[PDB]
Structure formats: structure tokens, C-alpha cells
Coordinates of C-alpha atoms and ligand atoms in Angstrom, one line a residue:
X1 CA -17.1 -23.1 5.4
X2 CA -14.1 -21.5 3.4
X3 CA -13.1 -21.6 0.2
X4 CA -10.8 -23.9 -1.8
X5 CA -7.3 -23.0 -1.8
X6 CA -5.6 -23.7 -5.5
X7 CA -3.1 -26.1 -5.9
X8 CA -0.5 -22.9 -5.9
X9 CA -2.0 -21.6 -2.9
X10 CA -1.9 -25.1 -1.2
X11 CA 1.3 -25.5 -2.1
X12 CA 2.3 -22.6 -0.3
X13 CA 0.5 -23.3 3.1
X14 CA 2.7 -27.3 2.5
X15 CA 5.5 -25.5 2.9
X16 CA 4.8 -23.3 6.0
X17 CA 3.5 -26.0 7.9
X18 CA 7.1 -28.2 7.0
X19 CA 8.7 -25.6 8.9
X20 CA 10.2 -24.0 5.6
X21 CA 10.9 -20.1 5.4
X22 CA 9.5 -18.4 2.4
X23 CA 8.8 -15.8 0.4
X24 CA 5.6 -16.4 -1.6
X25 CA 4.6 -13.6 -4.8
X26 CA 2.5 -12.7 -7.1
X27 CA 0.4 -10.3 -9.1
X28 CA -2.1 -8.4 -7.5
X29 CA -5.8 -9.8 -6.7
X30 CA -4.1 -13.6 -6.7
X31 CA -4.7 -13.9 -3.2
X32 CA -1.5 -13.7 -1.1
X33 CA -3.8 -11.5 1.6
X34 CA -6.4 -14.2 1.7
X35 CA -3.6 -16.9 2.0
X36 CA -1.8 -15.2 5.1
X37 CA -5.7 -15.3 7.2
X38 CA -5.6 -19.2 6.0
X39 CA -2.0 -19.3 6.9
X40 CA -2.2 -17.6 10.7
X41 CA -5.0 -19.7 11.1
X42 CA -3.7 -23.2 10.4
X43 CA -0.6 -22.7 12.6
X44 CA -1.0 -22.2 16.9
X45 CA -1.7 -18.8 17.7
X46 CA 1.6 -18.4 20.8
X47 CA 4.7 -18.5 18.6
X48 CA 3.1 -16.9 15.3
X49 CA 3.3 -12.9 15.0
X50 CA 1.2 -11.0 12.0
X51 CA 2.7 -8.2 10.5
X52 CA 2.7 -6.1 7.6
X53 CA 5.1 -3.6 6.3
X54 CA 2.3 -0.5 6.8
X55 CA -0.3 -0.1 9.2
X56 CA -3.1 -0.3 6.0
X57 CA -1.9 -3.5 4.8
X58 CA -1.7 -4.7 8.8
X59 CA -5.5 -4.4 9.3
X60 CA -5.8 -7.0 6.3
X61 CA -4.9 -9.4 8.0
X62 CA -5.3 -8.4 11.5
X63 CA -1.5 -8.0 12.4
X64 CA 0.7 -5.2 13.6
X65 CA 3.0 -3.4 11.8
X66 CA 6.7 -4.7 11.5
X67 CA 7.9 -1.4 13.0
X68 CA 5.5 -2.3 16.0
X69 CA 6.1 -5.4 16.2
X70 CA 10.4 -5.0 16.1
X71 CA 10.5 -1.8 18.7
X72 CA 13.8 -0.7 17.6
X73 CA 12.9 3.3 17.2
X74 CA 12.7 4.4 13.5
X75 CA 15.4 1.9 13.1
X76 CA 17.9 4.7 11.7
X77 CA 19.7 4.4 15.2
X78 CA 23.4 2.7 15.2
X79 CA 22.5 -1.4 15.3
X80 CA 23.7 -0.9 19.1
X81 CA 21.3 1.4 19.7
X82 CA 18.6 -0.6 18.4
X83 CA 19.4 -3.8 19.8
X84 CA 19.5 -2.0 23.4
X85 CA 16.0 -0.8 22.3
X86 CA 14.6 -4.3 21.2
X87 CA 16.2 -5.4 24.9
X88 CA 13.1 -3.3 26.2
X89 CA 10.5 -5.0 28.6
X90 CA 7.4 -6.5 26.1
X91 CA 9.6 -5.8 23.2
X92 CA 12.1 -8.4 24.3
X93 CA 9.8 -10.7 25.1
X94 CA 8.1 -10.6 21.3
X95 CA 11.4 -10.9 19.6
X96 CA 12.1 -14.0 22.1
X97 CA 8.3 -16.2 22.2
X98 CA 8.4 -15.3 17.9
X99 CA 9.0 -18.4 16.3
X100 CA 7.3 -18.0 13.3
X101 CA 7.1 -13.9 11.6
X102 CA 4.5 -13.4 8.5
X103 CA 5.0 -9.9 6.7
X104 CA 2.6 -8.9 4.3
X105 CA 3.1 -6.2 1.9
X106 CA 7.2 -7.0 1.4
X107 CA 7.9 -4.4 -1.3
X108 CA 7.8 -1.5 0.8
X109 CA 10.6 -2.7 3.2
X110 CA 14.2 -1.5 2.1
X111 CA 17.1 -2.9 2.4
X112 CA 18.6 -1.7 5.0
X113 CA 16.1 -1.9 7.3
X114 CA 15.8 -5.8 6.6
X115 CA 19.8 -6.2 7.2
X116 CA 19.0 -4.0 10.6
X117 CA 15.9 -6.5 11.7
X118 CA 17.8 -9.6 10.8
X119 CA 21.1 -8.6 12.8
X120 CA 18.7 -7.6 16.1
X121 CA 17.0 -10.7 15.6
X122 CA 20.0 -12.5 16.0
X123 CA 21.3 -10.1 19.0
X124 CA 18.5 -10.6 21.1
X125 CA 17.6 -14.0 20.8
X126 CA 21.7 -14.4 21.0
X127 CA 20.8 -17.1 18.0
X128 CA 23.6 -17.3 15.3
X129 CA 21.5 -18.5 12.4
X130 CA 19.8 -16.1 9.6
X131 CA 17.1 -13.9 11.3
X132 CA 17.9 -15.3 14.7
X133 CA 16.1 -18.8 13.6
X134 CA 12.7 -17.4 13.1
X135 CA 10.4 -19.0 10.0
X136 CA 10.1 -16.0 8.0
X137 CA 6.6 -16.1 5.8
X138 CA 6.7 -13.5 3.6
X139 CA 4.4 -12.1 0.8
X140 CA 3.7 -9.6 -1.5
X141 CA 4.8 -7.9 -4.7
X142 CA 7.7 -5.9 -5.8
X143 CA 6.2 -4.4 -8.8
X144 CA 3.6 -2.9 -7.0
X145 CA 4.4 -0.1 -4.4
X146 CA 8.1 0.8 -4.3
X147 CA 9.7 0.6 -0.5
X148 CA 10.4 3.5 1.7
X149 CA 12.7 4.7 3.8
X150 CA 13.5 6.8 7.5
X151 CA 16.2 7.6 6.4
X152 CA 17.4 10.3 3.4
X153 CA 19.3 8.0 0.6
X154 CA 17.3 5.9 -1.8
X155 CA 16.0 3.3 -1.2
X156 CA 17.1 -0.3 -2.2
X157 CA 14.2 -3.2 -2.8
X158 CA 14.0 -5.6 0.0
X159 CA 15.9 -8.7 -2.4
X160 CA 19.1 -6.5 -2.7
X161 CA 19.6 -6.6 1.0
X162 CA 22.6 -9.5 1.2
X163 CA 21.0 -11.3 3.5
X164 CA 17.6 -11.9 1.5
X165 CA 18.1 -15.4 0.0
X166 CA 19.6 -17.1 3.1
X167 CA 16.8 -15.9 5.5
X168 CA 14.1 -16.5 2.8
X169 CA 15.5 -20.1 0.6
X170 CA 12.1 -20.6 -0.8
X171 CA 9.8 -19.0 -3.3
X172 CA 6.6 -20.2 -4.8
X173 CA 4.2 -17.6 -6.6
X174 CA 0.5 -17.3 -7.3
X175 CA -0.5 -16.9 -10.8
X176 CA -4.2 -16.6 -10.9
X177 CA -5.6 -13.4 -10.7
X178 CA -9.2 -13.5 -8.0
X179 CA -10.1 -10.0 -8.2
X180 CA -11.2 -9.7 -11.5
X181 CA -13.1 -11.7 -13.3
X182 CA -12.9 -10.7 -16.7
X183 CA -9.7 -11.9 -19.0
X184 CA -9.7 -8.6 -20.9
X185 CA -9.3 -6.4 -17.7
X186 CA -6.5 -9.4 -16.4
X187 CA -4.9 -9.0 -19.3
X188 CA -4.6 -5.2 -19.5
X189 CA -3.2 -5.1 -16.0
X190 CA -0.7 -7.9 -16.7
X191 CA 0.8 -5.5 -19.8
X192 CA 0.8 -2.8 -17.0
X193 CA 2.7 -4.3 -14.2
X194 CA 5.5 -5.4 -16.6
X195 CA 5.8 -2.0 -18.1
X196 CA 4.6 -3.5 -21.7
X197 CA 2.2 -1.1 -22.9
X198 CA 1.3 -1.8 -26.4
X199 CA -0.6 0.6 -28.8
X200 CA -3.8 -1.8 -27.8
X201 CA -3.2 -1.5 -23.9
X202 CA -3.0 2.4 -24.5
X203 CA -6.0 2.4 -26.6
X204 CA -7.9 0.1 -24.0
X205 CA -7.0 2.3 -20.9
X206 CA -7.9 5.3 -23.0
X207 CA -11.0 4.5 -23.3
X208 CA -12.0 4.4 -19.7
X209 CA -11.7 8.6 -19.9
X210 CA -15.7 8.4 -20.8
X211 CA -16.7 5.6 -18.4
X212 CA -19.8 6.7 -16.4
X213 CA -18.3 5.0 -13.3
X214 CA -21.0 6.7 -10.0
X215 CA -24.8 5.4 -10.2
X216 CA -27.5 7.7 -8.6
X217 CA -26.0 10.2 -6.3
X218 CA -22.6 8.3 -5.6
X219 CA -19.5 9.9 -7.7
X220 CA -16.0 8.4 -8.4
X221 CA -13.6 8.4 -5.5
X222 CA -10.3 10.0 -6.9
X223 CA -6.7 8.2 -6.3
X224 CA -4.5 10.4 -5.4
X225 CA -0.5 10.4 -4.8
X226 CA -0.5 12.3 -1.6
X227 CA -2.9 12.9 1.6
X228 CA -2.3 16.7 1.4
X229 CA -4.8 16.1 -2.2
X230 CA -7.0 14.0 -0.6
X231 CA -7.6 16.2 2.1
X232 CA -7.8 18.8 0.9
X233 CA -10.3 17.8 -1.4
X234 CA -12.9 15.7 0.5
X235 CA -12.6 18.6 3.2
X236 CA -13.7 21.1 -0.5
X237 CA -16.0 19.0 -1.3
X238 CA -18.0 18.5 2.2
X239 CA -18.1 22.4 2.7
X240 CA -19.8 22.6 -0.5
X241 CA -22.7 20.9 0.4
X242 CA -25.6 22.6 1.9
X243 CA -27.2 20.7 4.6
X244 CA -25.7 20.9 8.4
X245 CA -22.9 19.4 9.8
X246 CA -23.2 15.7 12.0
X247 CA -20.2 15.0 13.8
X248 CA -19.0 12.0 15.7
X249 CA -16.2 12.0 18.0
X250 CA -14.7 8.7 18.3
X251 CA -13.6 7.2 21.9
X252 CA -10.0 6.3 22.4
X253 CA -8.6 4.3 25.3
X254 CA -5.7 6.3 25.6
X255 CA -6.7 9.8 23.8
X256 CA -3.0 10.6 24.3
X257 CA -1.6 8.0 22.1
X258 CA -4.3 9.4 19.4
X259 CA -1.4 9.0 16.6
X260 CA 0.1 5.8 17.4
X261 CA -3.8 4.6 17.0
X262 CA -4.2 6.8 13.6
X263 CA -1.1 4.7 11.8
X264 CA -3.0 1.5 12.6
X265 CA -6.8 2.4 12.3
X266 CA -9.1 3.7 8.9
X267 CA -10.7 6.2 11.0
X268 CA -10.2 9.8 12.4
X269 CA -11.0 11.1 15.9
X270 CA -13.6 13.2 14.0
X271 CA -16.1 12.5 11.2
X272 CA -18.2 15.0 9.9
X273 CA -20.9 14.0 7.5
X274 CA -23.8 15.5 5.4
X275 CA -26.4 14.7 3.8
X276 CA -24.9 14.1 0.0
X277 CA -21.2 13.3 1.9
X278 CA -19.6 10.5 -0.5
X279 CA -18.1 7.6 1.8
X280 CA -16.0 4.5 2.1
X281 CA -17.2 1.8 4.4
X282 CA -13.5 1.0 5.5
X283 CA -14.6 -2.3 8.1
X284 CA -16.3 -5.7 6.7
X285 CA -19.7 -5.6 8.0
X286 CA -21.3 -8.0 5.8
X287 CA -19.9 -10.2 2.8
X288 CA -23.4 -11.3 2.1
X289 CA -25.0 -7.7 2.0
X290 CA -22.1 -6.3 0.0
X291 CA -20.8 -4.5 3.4
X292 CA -17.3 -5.3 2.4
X293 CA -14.2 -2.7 3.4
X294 CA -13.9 -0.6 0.5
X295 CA -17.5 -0.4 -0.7
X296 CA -18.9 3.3 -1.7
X297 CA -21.8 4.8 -0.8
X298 CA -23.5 8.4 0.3
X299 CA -25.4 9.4 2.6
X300 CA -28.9 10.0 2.1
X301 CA -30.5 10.4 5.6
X302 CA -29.6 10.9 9.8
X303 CA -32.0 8.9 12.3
X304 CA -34.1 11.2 14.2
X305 CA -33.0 9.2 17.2
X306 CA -30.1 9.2 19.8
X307 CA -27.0 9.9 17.9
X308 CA -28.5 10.7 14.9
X309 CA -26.4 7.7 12.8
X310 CA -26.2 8.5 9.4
X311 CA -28.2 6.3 6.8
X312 CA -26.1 5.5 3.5
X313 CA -26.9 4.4 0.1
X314 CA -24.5 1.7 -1.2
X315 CA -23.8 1.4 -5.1
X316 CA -24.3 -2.0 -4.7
X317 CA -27.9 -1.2 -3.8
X318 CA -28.1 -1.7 0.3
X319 CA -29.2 1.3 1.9
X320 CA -28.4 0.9 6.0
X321 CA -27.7 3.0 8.9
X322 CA -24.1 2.9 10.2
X323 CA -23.4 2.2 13.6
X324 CA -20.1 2.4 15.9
X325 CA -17.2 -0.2 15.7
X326 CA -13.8 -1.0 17.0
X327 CA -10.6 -1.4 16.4
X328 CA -7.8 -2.7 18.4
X329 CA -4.4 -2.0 17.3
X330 CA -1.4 -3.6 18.8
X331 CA 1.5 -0.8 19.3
X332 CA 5.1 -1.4 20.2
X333 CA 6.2 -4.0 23.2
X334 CA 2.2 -5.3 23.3
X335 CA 0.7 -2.5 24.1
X336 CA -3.3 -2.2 22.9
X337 CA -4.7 0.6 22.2
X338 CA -8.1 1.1 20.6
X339 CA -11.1 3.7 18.9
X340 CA -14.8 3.2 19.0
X341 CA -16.1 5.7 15.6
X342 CA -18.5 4.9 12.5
X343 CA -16.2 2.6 9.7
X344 CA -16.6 5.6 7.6
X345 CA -14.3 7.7 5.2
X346 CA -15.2 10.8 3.3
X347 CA -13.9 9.7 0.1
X348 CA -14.2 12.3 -3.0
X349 CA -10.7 11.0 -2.7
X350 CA -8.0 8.6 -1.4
X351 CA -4.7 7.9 -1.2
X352 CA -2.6 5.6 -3.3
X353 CA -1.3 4.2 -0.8
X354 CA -4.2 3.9 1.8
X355 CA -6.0 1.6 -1.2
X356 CA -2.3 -0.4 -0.8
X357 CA -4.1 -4.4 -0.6
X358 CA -8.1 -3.4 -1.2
X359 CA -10.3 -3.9 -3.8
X360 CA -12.4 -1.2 -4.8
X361 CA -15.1 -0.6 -7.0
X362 CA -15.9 3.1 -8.1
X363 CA -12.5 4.8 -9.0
X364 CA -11.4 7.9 -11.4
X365 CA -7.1 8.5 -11.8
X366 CA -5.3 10.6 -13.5
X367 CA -2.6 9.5 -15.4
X368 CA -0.7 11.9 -17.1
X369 CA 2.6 12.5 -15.3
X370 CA 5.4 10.6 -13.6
X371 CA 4.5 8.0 -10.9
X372 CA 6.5 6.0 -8.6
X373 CA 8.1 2.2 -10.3
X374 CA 4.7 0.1 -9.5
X375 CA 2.4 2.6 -8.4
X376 CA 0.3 3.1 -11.2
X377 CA -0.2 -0.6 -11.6
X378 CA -1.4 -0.5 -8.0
X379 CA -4.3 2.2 -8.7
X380 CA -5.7 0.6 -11.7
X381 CA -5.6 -3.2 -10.4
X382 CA -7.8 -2.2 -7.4
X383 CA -10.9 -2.1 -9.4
X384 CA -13.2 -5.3 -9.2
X385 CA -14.1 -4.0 -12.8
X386 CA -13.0 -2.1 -15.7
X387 CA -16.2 -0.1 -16.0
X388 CA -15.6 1.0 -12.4
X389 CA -12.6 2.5 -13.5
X390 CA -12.3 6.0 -14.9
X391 CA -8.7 6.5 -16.1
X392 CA -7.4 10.1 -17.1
X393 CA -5.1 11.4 -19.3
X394 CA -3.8 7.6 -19.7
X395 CA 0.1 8.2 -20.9
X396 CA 2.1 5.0 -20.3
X397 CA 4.7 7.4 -19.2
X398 CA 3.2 6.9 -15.7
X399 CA 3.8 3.6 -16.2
X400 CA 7.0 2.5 -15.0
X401 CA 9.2 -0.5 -13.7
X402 CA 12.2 -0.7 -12.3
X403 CA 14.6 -2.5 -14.2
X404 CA 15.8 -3.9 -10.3
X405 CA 12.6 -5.8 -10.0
X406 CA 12.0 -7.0 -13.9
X407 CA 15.7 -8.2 -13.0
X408 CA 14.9 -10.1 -9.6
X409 CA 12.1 -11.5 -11.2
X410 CA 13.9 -13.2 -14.4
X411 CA 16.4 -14.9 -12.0
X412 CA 13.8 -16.0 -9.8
X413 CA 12.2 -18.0 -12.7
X414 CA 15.6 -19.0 -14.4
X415 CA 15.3 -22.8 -13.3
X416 CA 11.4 -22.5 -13.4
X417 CA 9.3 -24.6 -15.9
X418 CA 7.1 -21.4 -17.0
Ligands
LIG1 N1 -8.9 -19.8 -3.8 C1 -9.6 -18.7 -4.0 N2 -10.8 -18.9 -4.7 C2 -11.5 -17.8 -4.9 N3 -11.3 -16.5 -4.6 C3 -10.1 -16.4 -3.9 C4 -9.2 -17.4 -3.6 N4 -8.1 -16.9 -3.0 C5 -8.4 -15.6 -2.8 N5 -9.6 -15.2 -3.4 C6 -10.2 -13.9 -3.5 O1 -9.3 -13.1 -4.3 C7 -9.5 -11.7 -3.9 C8 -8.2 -11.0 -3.7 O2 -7.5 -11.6 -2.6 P1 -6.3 -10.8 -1.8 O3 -5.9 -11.7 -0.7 O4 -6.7 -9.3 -1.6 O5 -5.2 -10.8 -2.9 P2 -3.7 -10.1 -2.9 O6 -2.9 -11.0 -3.7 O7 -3.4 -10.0 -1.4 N6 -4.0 -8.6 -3.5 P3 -2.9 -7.4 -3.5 O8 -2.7 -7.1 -2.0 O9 -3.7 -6.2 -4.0 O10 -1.7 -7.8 -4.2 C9 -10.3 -11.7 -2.6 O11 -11.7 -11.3 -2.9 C10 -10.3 -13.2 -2.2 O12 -11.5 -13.7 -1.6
LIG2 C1 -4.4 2.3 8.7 C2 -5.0 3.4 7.9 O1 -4.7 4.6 8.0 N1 -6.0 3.0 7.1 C3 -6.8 3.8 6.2 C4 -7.4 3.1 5.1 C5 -8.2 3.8 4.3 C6 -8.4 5.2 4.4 C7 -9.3 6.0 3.5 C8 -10.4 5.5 2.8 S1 -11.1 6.7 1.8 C9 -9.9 7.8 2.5 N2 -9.9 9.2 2.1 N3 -9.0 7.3 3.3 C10 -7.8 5.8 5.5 C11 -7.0 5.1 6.4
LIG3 MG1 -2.8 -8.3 -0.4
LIG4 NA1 -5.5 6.5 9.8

């Protein structure tokens, strides 16, 4: 069985089913992820297209990625340019058969990119009403990560584009936080993703610096603002332990298209391990054994046998050996592509933005410097728990809104009751 949706979250899937475009919000761990997988599977699959604004966020909910799913190049092209490109054989044929279009992750779509899909939306399906007439079903939250752009000017949030409130009329949020379960924590991250950091919140996140956050043998995996860091360091960290190294070379069905598959897929053509490696289950293997994407473990053994799988020791206790899976990722115009490798990350380290939509459990940050409007909010409100966090060199300097969003938000709830 599944579990009970809230009256919010109910409310939400009312108004999908009516037909009704939407935009649905709110703070991180409430459950706008879990809603979309109710959503997708409450409505007929031929008609309904997943997507998400990244390819992380996509594998959430087992969609594509908008950019995948749209097929008009980077979309930086003149509009003719990209509707001739959308005109494409199994491109064309998506933007016609879509009828209804989720996107998870909204805050990372600009502006101008929205004003570019909604005007080749309307071109190809030669439909003159908002978006060509598709139900948009849109989530996620603009104070957490900050959209980007193909282009080189900055970027504008995805409610500045002038065609936001007629394509989406509708917006209902979700207020209760899931992911954590204790009020102190909820609180503390409330304060941070509205830029209100007290003398108390300060004091709170401060005192994380001497959390013990790694149990026998497993170590905090460091958030990090860029890949080259993360890199850089779990590749440091591997060489410095002594035993051999294991590798496993995955199997791609089309080798050639190795980085269309790497936007869309956790893991790398090559994994080395040894013994002492720290690692990220990045697939769902088992709710009930704690096998969950995201949990942390190292490896303490390889099997004598055959491939020589490595054997890992879970903080939540499980020790298993991992074997091979899949994924399938759907490319541009339909195309499927896919990797067989271990679900396994080195992870001394990870990105901010690969943890985009996860929950974790076993994280150190350092946060001491300028960060991105939402961004810190996003590292610290992927920890199931407070004492799995390990802050740094807390400042609320790294803490910042932008005033765009805070903005958004108060008109969104002028007419509201709370
Ligand atoms: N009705 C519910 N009852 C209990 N747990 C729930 C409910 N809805 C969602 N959850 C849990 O809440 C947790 C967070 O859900 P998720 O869908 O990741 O939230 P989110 O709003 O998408 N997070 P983020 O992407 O970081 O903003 C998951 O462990 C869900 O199982
Ligand atoms: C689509 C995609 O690229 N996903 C993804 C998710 C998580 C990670 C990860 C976990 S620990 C680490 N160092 N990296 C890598 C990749
Ligand atoms: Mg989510
Ligand atoms: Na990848």
C-alpha cells in the first residue's frame, strides 16, 4: 500500500485530475517529489510526459529532462531555429501526443528559456492558447537552487518570464515538512530559507562544527560547490588508501553516446573501489533494509568469486554485497539509451547540486563564504537529522535570498488566509 496524502497534498492531485494547470511549492522535504510519482501515476500513462529541470532531479521521478524532452538544441538558437528543430522526427511527435507536461525542480529554469518553450509549444502544435494548450504541472522551490542559463547574461527566475501566470493560473503549496522529524531542526531551516538568521539560528548551526557525524569506519561526505572539488577530492582520497584497485567497467548500449547517458545516470563508465573507499548507494534497493538512494557506506570486503563485487558496510548497520543495475534514460526525440554498473559513488565528497532533491544522512559543509541565493539552504535541508550534519565555519553571510523570490512569494500569498 502507499501512504496517505495530506489534505495539502490531496488538494493538489484535485486539481490535476480537473484538468487545471498548476504550479504547486513549497519548502524542502514537504513532499512535492513524492506527489509528482502519485501524480504520474493517477493520470494515463500516453499523453503524460515527466520531466525535470536537471537530469538529477529527473531520476526522482523517473522522467527526462526538459531539455530532452523539448529538442530544440541548447535553446539559445533564434525561436526559428528552434521551432524548425522541435519539427524534427520523434521530437515532433512528443511535443504533439503531450497533453499533459510535469516539471519538477522549476527554480532552475530561467526566464527566457520558459518564454522560448512556451512560443515552440504553440508553433508546433500550431495551438494559439498559453503553452500550446498543454496542462502544465509544475513543482518545486525558488528559494532553493537559483536557475541557470546557456546563455552569458543573468539569469531571471522562471515567475519573471511574462508569460508565467497565464500558462500556470493556479498555485497551492505544501507546508509540512516530511524529511525531518524533529521541530528544532524544521525550525532552524525555515529561519534559513527566508534569510532570517537570528543570533539563536547562528548559535544553533554553530554548534554542529563538533558533531561527530561518521560511525565506525564511514566519514562525512563533504558538499561541495563545484565537481572540479569533488573530484578532485574523492579521486585524493582513493589513492591514499593502501589496498589494490577493483574496477568495474559499466556496459552502455550505445558507448558512443557515453555523455548524453552521463547527464541522466548517477554512475560513471568506471568505478574504482578499495577496501576503506567511502560510497553513496545512488539507486533504491531496499526501503525496508535502509538501501535507499543516498545512504552511505564503505567498503569493507571484495567476494572471492566472479567479479569480485564489493561488500559494503552501511551506517545504518546493513552490511551487503552490491551487485549490477540499470538505468534507462530517455534522450532527445525518444531515443533510449542505457548503463549496466554497481549504484555506487565514491563520495568523500559531492556536489551541491548533484544532492539537488535527496535526502542524505552523513554530511559536513563549509560555510564561510559567499553562496548562490538558495544554495546553502539546499545543503543543510538534505540531512534527515541535525546530528548528521557537520556545518563549518557557519557565517549567515552564505546565507542569502534574493529579494526577487521573498518578492514573488509575498504576492503569491497576498489574498491567502496564512
Ligand atoms: N504524506 C506523506 N506522509 C509521510 N511522508 C511523506 C508524505 N509525503 C511525502 N513524504 C516523505 O517526505 C520525504 C521527502 O519527500 P520529497 O518528495 O523528497 O520532498 P520534496 O518536497 O520533493 N524535497 P526537495 O526536492 O528537497 O524540495 C520522503 O521521504 C517522502 O516519503
Ligand atoms: C544524473 C546524475 O548525474 N546524478 C548523480 C547523482 C549523484 C552523484 C553523486 C553521488 S556522491 C557523488 N560524488 N556524486 C552523481 C551523479
Ligand atoms: Mg523534490
Ligand atoms: Na552523471
Amino acid at each position: 500500500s502507499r501512504m496517505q496524502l495530506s489534505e495539502e497534498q490531496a488538494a493538489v492531485l484535485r486539481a490535476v485530475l480537473k484538468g487545471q494547470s498548476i504550479f504547486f511549492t513549497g519548502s524542502a522535504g514537504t513532499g512535492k517529489s513524492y506527489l509528482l510519482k502519485r501524480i504520474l501515476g493517477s493520470l494515463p500513462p500516453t499523453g503524460t510526459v515527466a520531466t525535470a529541470s536537471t537530469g538529477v532531479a529527473a531520476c526522482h521521478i523517473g522522467g527526462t529532462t526538459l531539455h530532452a524532452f523539448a529538442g530544440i538544441g541548447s535553446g539559445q538558437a533564434p525561436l526559428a531555429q528552434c521551432v524548425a528543430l522541435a519539427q524534427r522526427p520523434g521530437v515532433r511527435q512528443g511535443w504533439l501526443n503531450c497533453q499533459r507536461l510535469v516539471i519538477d525542480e522549476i527554480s532552475m529554469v530561467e526566464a527566457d528559456l520558459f518564454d522560448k518553450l512556451e512560443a515552440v509549444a504553440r508553433a508546433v502544435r500550431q495551438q494559439n492558447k498559453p503553452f500550446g494548450g498543454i496542462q502544465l504541472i509544475i513543482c518545486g522551490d525558488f528559494l532553493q537552487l537559483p536557475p541557470v542559463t546557456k546563455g552569458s547574461q543573468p539569469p531571471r527566475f522562471c515567475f519573471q518570464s511574462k508569460s508565467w501566470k497565464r500558462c500556470v493560473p493556479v498555485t497551492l503549496e505544501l507546508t509540512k515538512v516530511w524529511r525531518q522529524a524533529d521541530q528544532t531542526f524544521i525550525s532552524l531551516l525555515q529561519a534559513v530559507r527566508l534569510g532570517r538568521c537570528s543570533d539563536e539560528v547562528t548559535r544553533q548551526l554553530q554548534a554542529t562544527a563538533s558533531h561527530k557525524v561518521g560511525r565506525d569506519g564511514i566519514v562525512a561526505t563533504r558538499l561541495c560547490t563545484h565537481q572540479d572539488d569533488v573530484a578532485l577530492t574523492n579521486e585524493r582520497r582513493l589513492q591514499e588508501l593502501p589496498g589494490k584497485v577493483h574496477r568495474f567497467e559499466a556496459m552502455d548500449s550505445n558507448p558512443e553516446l557515453a555523455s548524453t547517458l552521463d547527464a541522466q545516470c548517477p554512475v560513471s563508465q568506471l568505478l574504482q573501489l578499495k577496501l576503506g573507499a567511502q560510497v553513496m548507494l545512488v539507486k533504491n534497493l531496499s526501503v525496508s533494509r535502509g538501501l535507499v538512494n543516498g545512504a552511505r557506506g564503505v567498503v569493507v570486503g571484495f567476494e572471492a568469486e566472479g567479479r569480485g563485487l564489493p561488500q559494503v558496510r552501511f551506517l545504518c548497520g546493513v552490511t551487503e554485497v552490491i551487485h549490477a543495475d540499470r538505468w534507462t534514460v530517455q534522450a532527445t526525440g525518444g531515443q533510449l539509451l542505457s548503463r549496466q554498473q554497481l549504484p555506487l559513488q565514491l563520495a568523500w565528497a559531492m556536489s551541491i547540486h548533484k544532492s539537488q532533491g535527496m535526502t542524505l544522512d552523513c554530511v559536513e559543509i563549509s560555510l564561510g563564504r559567499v553562496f548562490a541565493s538558495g544554495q546553502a539552504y539546499v545543503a543543510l535541508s538534505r540531512a534527515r537529522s541535525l546530528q548528521g550534519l557537520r556545518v563549518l565555519d557557519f557565517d549567515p553571510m552564505a546565507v542569502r535570498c534574493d529579494p526577487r523570490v521573498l518578492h514573488f512569494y509575498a504576492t503569491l500569498r497576498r489574498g491567502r488566509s496564512l
